[PDB]
From a paper:
Among all bacterial pathogens, Legionella pneumophila maintains the largest known set of translocated substrates, delivering over 300 proteins to the host cell via its Type IVB, Icm/Dot translocation system. Through detailed structural and functional analysis, we show that metaeffector activity derives from a diverse range of mechanisms, shapes evolution, and can be used to reveal important aspects of each cognate effector's function. After release into the host cell, translocated bacterial substrates (effectors) regulate one another through several different functional interactions: indirectly, through counteracting modification of a shared host target, or directly through either steric complex formation or direct modification of one effector by another.
The de novo crystal structure of the metaeffector LupA (123–304) was determined to 1.9 Å resolution and reveals that LupA belongs to the ubiquitin or ubiquitin‐like protease (UBP) family of proteins with a canonical cysteine protease triad (inset). In vitro activity assays confirmed that Lpg1148 is a ubiquitin‐specific protease whose activity is abrogated by a mutation within the predicted catalytic triad. We therefore hypothesized that Lpg1148 (hereafter referred to as Legionella ubiquitin‐specific protease A—LupA) removes a ubiquitin modification from LegC3 that otherwise supports its activity in a proteasomal‐independent manner. These data reveal another novel mechanism of direct effector inactivation—the specific deubiquitination of a cognate effector—and suggest that LegC3 activity may depend upon modification by an endogenous (human) E3 ligase.
Author numbering: 123 to 192, 199 to 304
Amino acid sequence: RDQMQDHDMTLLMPKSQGRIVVMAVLNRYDSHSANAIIETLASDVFNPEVHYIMIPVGPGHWRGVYLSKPTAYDLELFDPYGPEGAAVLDDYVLDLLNQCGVPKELVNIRHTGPKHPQGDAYSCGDFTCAYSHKKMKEFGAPEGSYNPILIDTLDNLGNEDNVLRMTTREETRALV
Ligand SMILES: [Cl-]
Ligand SMILES: [Cl-]
């Protein structure tokens, strides 16, 4: 029941493939973290070959950011506890996008949460990793590029009986 840390997310998050980019972990408290990625994120925002950009945003209470290109960009802000808590990312992400050169009028925000939230701090990483895999599939990634075990656990069970944490451990060991 410890929380996922950066390296845990890095290991288990889906990886960029083709028109889907998955960025490295962002730390919303460290101004340097946002500053350091503007150029990479701007490059992807304005690259015709990229259509989707995912960002895991922490630390601590991990959340997911999913940008879909069209004029306006769809920006889904996912909070494992439920959609209301995703409000904490609105300004953060809008400012990140404005730094990249996207005005706020071109951004369609929506807040989301999971079907089966647990509402405990320790599993936010697990939810965000598994939800990111679910998005990977939704965005049309090929069968090998996402982890069906995590998607199907999340979708049907959430982290009831800590089963999502068990799949994240097991899938991790497989990767190691
Ligand atoms: Cl879900
Ligand atoms: Cl906790």
